[PDB]
């Protein structure tokens, strides 16, 4: 829903959300082909 948000937050007023007590599924992120730059710093994308 963060990725599907119709109107994203402004670049200066970037929305910060703390998420926990759930299961993070990164498989859908890999499956989606819309992403152009998926650079990861300090962590392997595969081991997410």
């Amino acid at each position, epitope marked *: 829903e963060v990725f599907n948000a119709t109107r994203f937050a402004s670049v200066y007023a970037w929305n910060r959300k703390r998420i926990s007590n759930c299961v993070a599924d990164y498989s859908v992120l*890999y*499956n989606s*082909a819309s992403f152009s730059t*998926f*650079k*990861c710093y*300090g*962590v*392997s994308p595969t*081991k997410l």
Partner: antibody
Amino acid sequence: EVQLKQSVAELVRPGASVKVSCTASGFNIKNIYMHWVKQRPEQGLDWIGRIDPANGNSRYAPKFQDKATITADTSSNTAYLQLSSLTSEDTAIYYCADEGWGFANWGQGTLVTVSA
Amino acid sequence: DIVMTQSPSSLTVTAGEKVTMSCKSSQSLLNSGNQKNYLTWYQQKVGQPPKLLIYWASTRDPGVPDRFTGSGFGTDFTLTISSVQAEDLAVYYCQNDYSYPLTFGAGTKVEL
């Protein structure tokens, strides 16, 4: 940022074993299954193999199978590369990796030199 | 095991001139879901290890990002540079990533 400071190259003798340790800063190895790569001078660079911190189950290139064994340390922010039956061809530069879409950060370079 | 052949000979070019180099990739590197090819370019000088020039076959890495955009469906890849500078005087490596057994290319030397 993030840097890979592998151990300085040291002289080795033929028929012996060498352990090369790569250190990382800004994160921990636990989320990084670093690759290992050697660059043969005046020749196309080639990939050695892959390891994992937990359940390493290392897989290497077919040319380096059963010859280059690499182990990953769970702690100390280090990983060790072991070699055996080193020859003159084995004198090459080695680098580390961050197993991104490409090898994001490589080692400074180690010349594993076999001589007398 | 994929045989990767880059441009064999060095391409002597004048400063600020376009270069046409390409490495042919076999096995038709493609992945399900994401259409981005799993071939990543590299930029290696004499003295320091190579760094990612392009990954996913089209993604400008931060730092000296003068084009490097590549148009390829998997069988062929291109890394044309419109203008070559001091930082562009290096050897470029194209490496496959979709196949688990991966090997790098021979290398292409470009100088001003």
